Every structure is written in structure tokens, then in C-alpha cells.
Design a protein around this ligand. Structure first.
Ligand SMILES: N=C(N)NCCC[C@H](NC(=O)[C@@H](CC(=O)NO)Cc1ccc2ccccc2c1)C(=O)NCC(=O)NCC(N)=O
Length: 961
């Protein structure tokens, strides 16, 4: 029949738990398509992935295909308004994004389900007739510059591009994918290039139907989705472009047996070991590099990390196969280094080769392959249902690699045992084929090369033949054993029947001095899993900086010592999260419920009978100090957000206070602190999953009883269950706090307009206003004025209080940023005046859909409940209630809200601004074609955070529901 469709796939294998319906197909023009039908979904979604990317940039215009990616959002022939796509998503509860990697350009969106077609029609135009408007091109190249700029001082981006700079310079692998204003405007103008033509050429040459894959997920029937896709995409034109390939490895003989010493921005010590390998992707049914990676990166007893860590050389290890492109891959073993480790690199590498030699000695092990195959089969039977935007984007990228019928399963199911491929990859991991990189500040001033894009200081040297040889002669070492059978592999999957008195919301089913237990048997997803959440309260976790430090150090010591044993639980889908909070501790255990009370008991029992190892303590202390220091290198906006948390919360210790207090933490002081920490606690828990009320009360009591037995824990007093308050700003005040980022050459600013306490009405005024401004703020402060790449607006909530915040990071100074934000607010008040009733109801409706969007997986529903509980507002039915009220609001309500709390001459404006100056600006003059900025008041400049808090009231806390 149908001329537009080349073929329709057979049944797409799915999990028997997956209620979604599926149909793959190839259009006549060669687009591979997956259609997904989910008649329950609140948001629909599409993605498109083009098998072209950075590796195919013209050598003379680096960043082109990334730049192209930005430009597609900026208008098409059919929809020429620059921001028609974004504004349309925004008005319909949607969102979009896109990335560029060396081989792919991947675009995706989601939207309210009622508006799939609308969104999809705008979206399809990207691939048909983008405008590449000339003035948009001139504007947007700044966003790309900014994007690169945020990366320049990031250690992972520096290392990522350094590796490319050290392979064969002629290989496409050495290209600079991001681009910047120099590569995409300046050098091009100099060399007489018309970038608008170059974008049109590149779009035209590579954006061919035969290199595309599309996924669409909506409520529509499979057939309705089919007609929609055929209608919007079969006009994409087939230019029959050959898929790029890269058979020649970027690392040839000259590039092997090399050592690189590199200077980090942060104080971090790492060792990176790499081997070039062939492309293993075609072997996906057997997956030799995953097998080798599971072994070499294992963390249990017998393992490489185990030895390295006992010797006190390393704390963490990553091992396995790394993506390259079509034609080449890499195999990596990477570790972090202790101060001792750094002096023993030759030896750490030797142990790496001994462990590899052990694998050669034992040969391939079917039983290990079996274990990996079983785990993966279980991961797949019971995978959490995904959010549509990521799912589509992810599936779009893999329609390029697997038959239609296998796209769901291809990355999970294992079929073939291949001792031959396993041997073959193992014979590549040899010292003659090795590359070695060491990162340490100790190389400060001893380097002689500079990487062009990032500025990285490094030195390159042949590894001495004597060293290659000592490595080639790696002997067996008896500290290394293959792992043994994994006892945490779950086998019990029954979904307990829903109990007669089971509730829609969690229920308070235990209310004692020691503990408060919220509980909900899962009535939605029906996977054999559960989430067990615990807040442990204790005034001794945050009483001062020394205690905060200790709470941290203790819990890190605890995790380091459970690691070897927890890691099996982790391979088996049972994981845990354990950290110190400003109120005490937080513990979360999630995964397959089968073996979960076993891991829970081991954790509480380790925690309350813990014995510290002097060697591990000194190593972790030093790491903690670096981590505290390394804050100086986070980015300006992160700094701005951080200082604002310090200014506005009643109690908060600074990184400076914590560093200072850390030299005073001693083994004996820590040994004392723990029993003290645990002597009086209150526990608030949410147990949510495949479990009964009786199992839940049981698990809770098991945690209490363990602490009672081993730490003699007694209940805390209700009065000592103290939450911190937010600083209460004065009607008409404006305060400014200013600092310098010493590393990055950009500013950051956070601006907080504080409104009032959270409550149904104040929540929906703020939230509605934020919905209405959200997209325009992006479109004004970034798309048009191009202030920076990071531009953000939205509700701030803390400590029961709220307001509107702006976060921008920019080359322009903060005083200027502030002036444009104020300009924009005026604009928004006129915009709300000029807007139709219906435009207003649309915003209501879009917020409404956002707030009502149902969780698709257990842990998302747990998150919502956990939010109600740690905030102690306990408003589990908040979404229906808040929306009921929203729907009642009017244009006049929001104008009044703005005029009272937000306008520049508002009677109750409460403003605080953090300015973070870039490395090289020296004063900040704190006050200062384009919209007119109002005149601002002289701000009170904050000199001292503590004084500032002393001199202001504190808000009440929010009464519980
Ligand atoms: N609220 C609306 N309407 N805007 C949606 C924001 C999407 C934006 N995405 C992008 O900047 C790029 C993706 C990327 O950088 N690839 O290289 C894609 C893009 C997308 C939408 C466009 C919309 C109009 C004009 C040009 C656009 C170009 C984004 O993710 N920024 C990252 C962010 O969240 N910053 C915080 C940080 N990184 O810490």
C-alpha cells in the first residue's frame, strides 16, 4: 500500500511490565521512526537525532554543527517569529533542548498531550527550512561563546580536549566541537567566510533524511501517530549522504607509550590510563568490553581498587570501555591519587597490569557472563517507566545502531558468550599500547606546552623502555582474585496484594518520641521495589563548624568501609545514599525490595558500632580539605547561589569556617563524637513501595532497636526538633553582598525578590507570575540581549519562605545585569496589562498541567512525599488544592501582586542581590534600541553576614497541615 513508508517493523520487544504500545517503521526517505502510544501520559514528546556532529565540522570553522544546533531554534520559513517554538512550548506546559556530540545532533521536546501536533509541526520545520536569520546569527554566537566560557576552567572539559590535542592532529578526533566567538565569527570574517551561507551549506549537505531517526510519544493510537509522522516528516529530503567513519584510530604508534603531566585548576590528583581499542559496538549481543569493565572496575574483595586502596594509594577507580566514534574506542582505568599514591604511580600501573595478567591466567568465565546477563535481564523486566522527553531523546540516538525490533532491548539483553572477543580485547590492554596521564598541582611551573583552546599547562614524555619492560613482566599477585557469586541478586519478585486499608497518600502509622513513620504501599507501578527514607535528627550534627566537619567525616568513613560489601548490592539494583545534613543525617535505601532489609540492617549496625581506621581517616581528612578549598574554583553563579543561602538562613557555617575547624578534628575527637551523635535522635521515615504496613512497622522498629542496642539511643525532646528560619527583609530595602571569583573570568549574580511565607495563595501568585515570565526572561536576557549562556528565573523556596529569583552569569558586570533585570520586569508588567484574557488562562492551564503531571516511577512519587515531610508541611494533596485555587485567579490579581511585592516602587519590595565579580574586574560600582531601565535606590552594602542577620527579624516557620 502506502507510498510514504518503506517498511513496518515487526513487534518491538518490550518488557511485559510495559503498558506502552510501540510501532517502528522506516519512511520512504529513510528516516527510522519509533512511535510510542501511551494513553495515560500527561505530556507528549518527540525527538529527532541526526547522525551528524562535531567530527564533521569544516576544519576551517570549528563549532559549526554545534552553532547550527543553536540556530535551528531561532525561526523557520513556516514559523518565522524567532521564539515561536519556545513560546509555544512554554504556553503549553512544554520544554525543549538539544545537544551536539561528535556524531550526533539530538533535539527533543515535551508538551501537554493535547498539543503534540502543534509542537511537532513547529519542530519538524527545523529540518526543512530554518531561516538562519542574519541578526539572530550575530546574537546567538555569544551564547555559544558564553557556553564555551563556562567550560574553560572546568577540569573535565580541559582534560577532554587535551586528550584530543594529543592524538593524531590530522584526525577529526582532534577537532574543537564547541566553538566560540573567535572560531565562529572573528576568524571567519577575517577569512572572508559568510557564516549564514556556511550554516545553509551544512544544513543542506548533512541534514538528510537518510541520516535521521525520530521518536514520537503521545496518547494517540499507533495508527494516528503513524499518519502524523508521515505527514510532517516525509517531506524531509533524501540527499543520500554516506555515514562518516573513522577506521583509523586517532592514537597511532607515535602516540602510544606516552606520559602526560598536567596542571589542574582544582587541587585534584588523578591518574588516567588509556588503551586504544577497536570499535566494539557491533559486538553488542556479547559485549566483551562490558565484561572486562565489570572485572577491572570491580570494587569488592579480591579486586584492583581493594589492593590500591589498602596500600593507601587510591580512593576511587573507574574502569572499562569508553565511546570513540564509528571506527575506534578506548579502554580506560582511572584513579584518584593520595599524596602517597602520587609518589607511586609506577607501582599503581604495575598492579593494574598484574590484575590484567590474572584475567589472562584464569581465562573468560561463563559464570560471570551469566551473572551480567541475569542482572541485565532483571534490570529490563522491571525498569522504571521513563519521563517521555528523555526516553524519546535516548531512543532517537539508538535507532541508528540497532534493528527496530531490538531498540528497547539492545542495550540490556546479552545473548552470546564470546571468550574469543574477551581474549581479543584483553590482548590490547598491554604496556606497549598504553597511554598515561597524571594530574597534580605538583607540576606547577614544570610544564612546557599549552593546549590551544583551554590553556591547559602540560608536559609530554616518552615512557622509558625500562618501565614498559617492568610492566610487560607483570607477575601474578595473590592479593587479586576474581569476585565470587553475588549473593544480593534478587530472586523474589512477588508484588504483595494491595491491602484492604491501603491509602492514596502516605499515612502516619507510628508517632512516638523516638520516631515518626509515614507509609504507603505502592498502588501505581507494581514493580518489586521499595524506597526506604530516613531523616535522623540530632543537634550535634550542626552545632558548630567542628561538629559539621565531624558529621561529614564520620559518614564518609562509614561509606568507605561498607564499600567493598555494598558494591555487590549496587550491581544487584540495591543502592543507598547516606549524608550529613544541617539537622543530622539522611539515609535512603532503594531498589528491589527482596534483599533490602539485609542491607538496611548492615548499615544501621555498622553506623552504631563503627571502628575508625587511622589510615583511612587521615586520607579522607586531607581529601575533605581539598574539597573545601576547591570551592574557590566552582563557577560565579554557583558562588552567587551559595552566598545567598548563607545570608538568608538563620544558621550556616561557611566553607571558610569549616576549613579552619578541620585541623582540630583528631582521631580521638571523632571517636568521641559518634556515640554522642547517636545518643539522642529522632527518626522521621517514609517507607513507600512493594511492602505491607506490618513489614514497614517492622523495618522501622528494626532500625530503632539496632540503635538502642548498640548506641543506647534515647528520644529527643519535641522542643529540640528545631527547624532554621529565613531572614525577614524590611519593606523597601535593597541589600547587596559582593565578592570576587578568583578563578573564572565571568560574573554571576543572584537577585532575590522575597515575597512572603508559603501558603496556598502566596504560592500560586508567585508560581503564576513565574510561569508568565519564564520564557520571556529567557528570550529577553539571553536571546535578545545576550547577557550570558546561563540565564534563569523562577520561585525560590527555603525555610517555608519564598520569592522570585534571577540567576545570570555573564561577561558584563553585576550592576549592569541588575539594570537589565529591572528593565525586563517593567516590560513584564506591560505585557501582563496588554495580554488577552485567554492568553492569561493559557498560562493558568500550563502551570496547572505542570503541577498535576503524575509521577511515572516509584521514586518520583516518593520525592513529592519526601518534600512534604522534610519541609514539615505534610500537604500530600497540595497539587489538587493549589490548582483549584490557581484556576480562580485573574489578570487583576496578578497585577496587584506585582504592584505590591515586585515593582521597583512597590510598598513591600524586599530585594537582596549577590554580586560575584569576575577574576579581572576590580571595583564593582554596585549601582549603574534596548528597553529603559528604571532608576534604582542606593543599596545597603552588606559588610558582614553575621551583623546583617543580627539586625533583622526572622520569619515564623510554616504551620504543619
Ligand atoms: N525557558 C526557555 N525557553 N529556554 C529553554 C532553555 C534551554 C537551554 N538550552 C541551550 O542553551 C542550547 C543547548 C546547548 O547548549 N547545546 O549546545 C539549545 C538551545 C535551546 C533553546 C533555545 C531557545 C531559543 C534560542 C536558542 C536556543 C538554543 C538550556 O538548557 N540552558 C542550560 C541551563 O539550564 N543553564 C544552567 C547551567 N548549565 O548550569
Amino acid at each position: 500500500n502506502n507510498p510514504a513508508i518503506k517498511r513496518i517493523g515487526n513487534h518491538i520487544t518490550k518488557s511485559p511490565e510495559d503498558k506502552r504500545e510501540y510501532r517502528g517503521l522506516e519512511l520512504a526517505n529513510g528516516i527510522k521512526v519509533l512511535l510510542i502510544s501511551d494513553p495515560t501520559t500527561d505530556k507528549s514528546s518527540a525527538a529527532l537525532d541526526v547522525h551528524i556532529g562535531s567530527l564533521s565540522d569544516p576544519p576551517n570553522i570549528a563549532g559549526l554543527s554545534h552553532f547550527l544546533q543553536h540556530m535551528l531554534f531561532l525561526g523557520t520559513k513556516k514559523y518565522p517569529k524567532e521564539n515561536e517554538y519556545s513560546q509555544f512550548l512554554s504556553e503549553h506546559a512544554g520544554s525543549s533542548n538539544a545537544f551536539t556530540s561528535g556524531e550526533h545532533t539530538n533535539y527533543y521536546f515535551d508538551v501537554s498531550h493535547e498539543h503534540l501536533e502543534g509542537a511537532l509541526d513547529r519542530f519538524a520545520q527545523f529540518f526543512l527550512s530554518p531561516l538562519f536569520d542574519e541578526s539572530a546569527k550575530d546574537r546567538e554566537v555569544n551564547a555559544v561563546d558564553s557556553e564555551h566560557e563556562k567550560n574553560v576552567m572546568n577540569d573535565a572539559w580541559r582534560l577532554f580536549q587535551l586528550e584530543k590535542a594529543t592524538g593524531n592532529p590530522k584526525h577529526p578526533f582532534s577537532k574543537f566541537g564547541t566553538g566560540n566567538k573567535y572560531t565562529l565569527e572573528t576568524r571567519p570574517n577575517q577569512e572572508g567566510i559568510d557564516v549564514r551561507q556556511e550554516l545553509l551549506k551544512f544544513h543542506s549537505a548533512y541534514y538528510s533524511s537518510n541520516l535521521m531517526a525520530v521518536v514520537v510519544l503521545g496518547r494517540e493510537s499507533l495508527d494516528d501517530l503513524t499518519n502524523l509522522v508521515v505527514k510532517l516528516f516525509s517531506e524531509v529530503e533524501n540527499k543520500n549522504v554516506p555515514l562518516p567513519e573513522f577506521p583509523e584510530h586517532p592514537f597511532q604508534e607515535e602516540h602510544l607509550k606516552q606520559l602526560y603531566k598536567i596542571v589542574p585548576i582544582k587541587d585534584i590528583r588523578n591518574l588516567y590510563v588509556t588503551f586504544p581499542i577497536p570499535d566494539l559496538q557491533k559486538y553488542y549481543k556479547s559485549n566483551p568490553g562490558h565484561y572486562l569493565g565489570h572485572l577491572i572496575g570491580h570494587e569488592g574483595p579480591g579486586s584492583l581498587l581493594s589492593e590500591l586502596k589498602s596500600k593507601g594509594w587510591v580512593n576511587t577507580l573507574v574502569g572499562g570501555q569508553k565511546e570513540g566514534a564509528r571506527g575506534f574506542m578506548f579502554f580506560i582505568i582511572n584513579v584518584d591519587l593520595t599524596e602517597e599514591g602520587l609518589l607511586h604511580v609506577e607501582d599503581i600501573i604495575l598492579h593494574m597490569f598484574q590484575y590484567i595478567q590474572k584475567l589472562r591466567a584464569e581465562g573468560p568465565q561463563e559464570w560471570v557472563f551469566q551473572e551480567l546477563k541475569d542482572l541485565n535481564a532483571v534490570a529490563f523486566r522491571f525498569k522504571d517507566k521513563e519521563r517521555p522527553r528523555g526516553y524519546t531523546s535516548k531512543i532517537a540516538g539508538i535507532l541508528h545502531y540497532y534493528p527496530l525490533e531490538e531498540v528497547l532491548t539492545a542495550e540490556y539483553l546479552l545473548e552470546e558468550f564470546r571468550p574469543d572477543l574477551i581474549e581479543m580485547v584483553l590482548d590490547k590492554l598491554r604496556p606497549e599500547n598504553v597511554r598515561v596521564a597524571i594530574v597534580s598541582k605538583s607540576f606547577e611551573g614544570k610544564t612546557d606546552r599549552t593546549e590551544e583552546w583551554y590553556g591547559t599547562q602540560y608536559k609530554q614524555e616518552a615512557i622509558p623502555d625500562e618501565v614498559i619492560k617492568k610492566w610487560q613482566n607483570a607477575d601474578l599477585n595473590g592479593k587479586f582474585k576474581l569476585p565470587t557469586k553475588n549473593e544480593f541478586i534478587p530472586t523474589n519478585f512477588e508484588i504483595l496484594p494491595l491491602e484492604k486499608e491501603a491509602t492514596p497518600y502516605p499515612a502516619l502509622i507510628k508517632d512516638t518520641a523516638m520516631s515518626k513513620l509515614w507509609f504507603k504501599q505502592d498502588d501505581k507501578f507494581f514493580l518489586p521495589k521499595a524506597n526506604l527514607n530516613f531523616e535522623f535528627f540530632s543537634p550535634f550534627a550542626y552545632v558548630d563548624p567542628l561538629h559539621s566537619n565531624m558529621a561529614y567525616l564520620y559518614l564518609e568513613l562509614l561509606k568507605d568501609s561498607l564499600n567493598e560489601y555494598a558494591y555487590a548490592a549496587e550491581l544487584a539494583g540495591l543502592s543507598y545514599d547516606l549524608q550529613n545534613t544541617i539537622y543530622g543525617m539522611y539515609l535512603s535505601v532503594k531498589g528491589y525490595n527482596d534483599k533490602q532489609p539485609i542491607l538496611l540492617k548492615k548499615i544501621i549496625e555498622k553506623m552504631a558500632t563503627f571502628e575508625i581506621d587511622e589510615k583511612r581517616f587521615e586520607i579522607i581528612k586531607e581529601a575533605y580539605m581539598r574539597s573545601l578549598n576547591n570551592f574557590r574554583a566552582e563557577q560565579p553563579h554557583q558562588h552567587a547561589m551559595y552566598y545567598l543561602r548563607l545570608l538568608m538562613t538563620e544558621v550556616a557555617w561557611t566553607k571558610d569556617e569549616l576549613k579552619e575547624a578541620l585541623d582540630d578534628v583528631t582521631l580521638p575527637r571523632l571517636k568521641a563524637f559518634i556515640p554522642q551523635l547517636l545518643s539522642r535522635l529522632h527518626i522521621e521515615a517514609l517507607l513507600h513501595g512493594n511492602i505491607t504496613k506490618q513489614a514497614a512497622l517492622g523495618i522501622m522498629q528494626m532500625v530503632e532497636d539496632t540503635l538502642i542496642e548498640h548506641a543506647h539511643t534515647k528520644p529527643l525532646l519535641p522542643s529540640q526538633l528545631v527547624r532554621y528560619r529565613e531572614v525577614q527583609l524590611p519593606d523597601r530595602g535593597w541589600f547587596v553582598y559582593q565578592q570576587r571569583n578568583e578563578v573564572h573570568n565571568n560574573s554571576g549574580i543572584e537577585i532575590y525578590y522575597q515575597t512572603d511565607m508559603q501558603s496556598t495563595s502566596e504560592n500560586m501568585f508567585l508560581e503564576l507570575f513565574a510561569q508568565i515570565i519564564s520564557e520571556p526572561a529567557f528570550n529577553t536576557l539571553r536571546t535578545k540581549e545576550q547577557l550570558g549562556y546561563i540565564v534563569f528565573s523562577g520561585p525560590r523556596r527555603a525555610n517555608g519562605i519564598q520569592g522570585l529569583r534571577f540567576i545570570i552569569q555573564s561577561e558584563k558586570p553585576p550592576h549592569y545585569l541588575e539594570s537589565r533585570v529591572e528593565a525586563f520586569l517593567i516590560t513584564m508588567e506591560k505585557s501582563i496589562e496588554d495580554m488577552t484574557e485567554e492568553a492569561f488562562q493559557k498560562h493558568i492551564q500550563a502551570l496547572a498541567i505542570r503541577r498535576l503531571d503524575k509521577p511515572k516511577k516509584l521514586s518520583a512519587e516518593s520525592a513529592k512525599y519526601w518534600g512534604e515531610i522534610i519541609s514539615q508541611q505534610y500537604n500530600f494533596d497540595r497539587d489538587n488544592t493549589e490548582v483549584a485555587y490557581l484556576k480562580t485567579l485573574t489578570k487583576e490579581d496578578i497585577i496587584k501582586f506585582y504592584k505590591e511585592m515586585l515593582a521597583v516602587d512597590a510598598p513591600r519590595r524586599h530585594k537582596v542581590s549577590v554580586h560575584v565579580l569576575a577574576r579581572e574586574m576590580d571595583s564593582n560600582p554596585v549601582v549603574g534600541n534596548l528597553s529603559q531601565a528604571p532608576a534604582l535606590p542606593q543599596p545597603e552594602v552588606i559588610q558582614n553576614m553575621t551583623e546583617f542577620k543580627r539586625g533583622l527579624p526572622l520569619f515564623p516557620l510554616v504551620k504543619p497541615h
